[PDB]
């Protein structure tokens, strides 16, 4: 749980929330997926700014699954680790 | 390779670079780890702003390893998926 390890989620210009994707038939059973708080971003003044968007960050992760106990399966899944703020101007 | 899938790395206010952590004795053999481009962040005007820091985003991932071919090991490793911009003010 990074809600206990890293507090970046709350201090980001692109802050996010955590969602428990629970499942007993897969390992890790519980996964913390990040959903962006806003469309816009937190600027300097501390307002939501719609000249940039908070966007999620995906990552492919290996997982084990089981039938329902005699069968197991290694599979790759896509999980959203956090949010970053994208801009049109570079 | 997200250098081929997602181009956020280059459009982030907290842009990052990719590093190939290659290893034949582990699966996935090659891993793309994100190193932040700057300490500060890209503001509206498009300058690096030192009133906020670009910070990496860690995530624990399962991996397989092998001896050097008769032994294997499932282990959890910490990898940096990308960068977000943290601020003192909330």
């Amino acid at each position: 749980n990074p809600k206990r390890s890293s507090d970046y989620y709350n201090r980001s210009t692109s802050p996010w929330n955590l969602h428990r994707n629970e499942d007993p038939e897969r390992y890790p059973s519980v996964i913390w997926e990040a959903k962006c708080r806003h469309l816009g971003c937190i600027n300097a003044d501390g307002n939501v700014d719609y000249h940039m968007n908070s966007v999620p960050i995906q990552q492919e992760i290996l997982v084990l699954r089981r039938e329902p106990p005699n069968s197991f399966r290694l599979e790759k899944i896509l999980v959203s680790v956090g949010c970053t703020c994208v801009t049109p101007i570079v | 390779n997200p250098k081929r899938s997602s181009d956020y790395y280059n459009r982030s206010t907290s842009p990052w670079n990719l590093h190939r952590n290659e290893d034949p004795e582990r699966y996935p053999s090659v891993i793309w780890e994100a190193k932040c481009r700057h300490l500060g962040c890209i503001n509206a005007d498009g300058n690096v702003d030192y009133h906020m820091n670009s910070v990496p985003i860690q995530q624990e991932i399962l991996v397989l390893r092998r001896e050097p071919p008769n032994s294997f090991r499932l282990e959890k490793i910490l990898v940096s998926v990308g960068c977000t911009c943290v601020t003192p003010i909330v």
């Binding site: 005699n70 069968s71 197991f72 399966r73 290694l74 599979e75 | 699966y27 092998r66």
Partner: peptide, 14 residues
Amino acid sequence: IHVTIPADLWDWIN
């Protein structure tokens, strides 16, 4: 017991 590995990991094991 039955184990299902991706096509990808088969390359690696061999």
